[PDB]
Amino acid sequence: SMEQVAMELRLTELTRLLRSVLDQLQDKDPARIFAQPVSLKEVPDYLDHIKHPMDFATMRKRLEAQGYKNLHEFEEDFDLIIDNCMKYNARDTVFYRAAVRLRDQGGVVLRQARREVDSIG
Template sequence: MWSKSVLNAKCRICRRKGDAEKMLLCDSCDRGHHMYCLRPAIKIVPAGDWYCPDCKPKSARISPRKVVRTKSFSQDESSEEEEEDDEEDTEESAEEQDENDSISSIEEVPVKRNLTYKIPQKPQKKGQKPSSAKKSTSESRRERSTRRNDDTPEKSNNRRRATGVWKDLASCEEILSELIKHKDSWPFVEPVSKKAVPDYYDIIKKPMDLGTVHKKMKEVQYPTPTEFISEVDQIFLNCHEYNESRSVVAKAATSLQIFFDTKLGKASISHYRAPVHPTKKRRTT
């Protein structure tokens, strides 16, 4: 029982103990999950049995094709019974109808109206003006040429840049999700609490955390990857400015920063990083 208690359980997501009041145990696999580590986060302890995302029972869905097939089979059976009843009546009048249909098909010929035929044009002599069709083709060619002239190299480059930026932002979102799932991201997932660290906001003038970066990414507040990379770098700068280099938090920041740099290099977006000016380190007493 002690191995399955809330006090001894480790969170399956952040792999850490603690916060027993905010720890949930799955009623199926008995694994611990912090309420704030779940996505979406749970603020209130659920009543009754609770199952983790891996143990939730999946409801079976009935495909619409099966329903349509059952309806079609029932309709086919009813239609077959009606056809058997009407076969005897239709056999007698089949010959008469064939004769009448053949006569009506000969007499009533459908008239097609508004038909367009292409008449071959005669070769024009010298001195004659071109036809309207040739004028329209020449005008369309001129419009195409003007559109091509309007597409200057600057505009085409801007379009290419815009499409490239959206692809790079998508890779930034993937890197952010991997940063949050990293084992050393636990000090940087949420903002620093004023109650736990009263003098933090007196020293750090630009506080930032991965949760705030994730919120901005979902709200599309980053026009380019440059702003995203600068705010993630600000997290590491704040950590090294406030904490000592031998502390656990500073070591976690160093490990996470190396992981972040390698991911930027693999995604080929490290060129978006703006030059970082060194800040004064905190004096230790």
């Protein structure tokens, strides 16, 4: 049907907007602390602490599989990156401090992407 194609043109457009958003969020992690999953060879107990790990490459794979159905799902994954890090690491660590900075700086980007997703439909 033509109705499923017009849908898929929009999902494709949403994928295109979210790709831009992701690149801007990741530019706020120049240390690349959140780039890749936490290593289970290096932190073997990690899953005892964190039930839903998340990182930027894992979000990218989902994105390129058009697996985000809306901005809310994308944001949830971004928040997991931050919240996991803030639980697993103590307050006086470079890791915790990096997540605080990413949250604060990411807010500006997510605020404008909310408006662009509503505006464009």
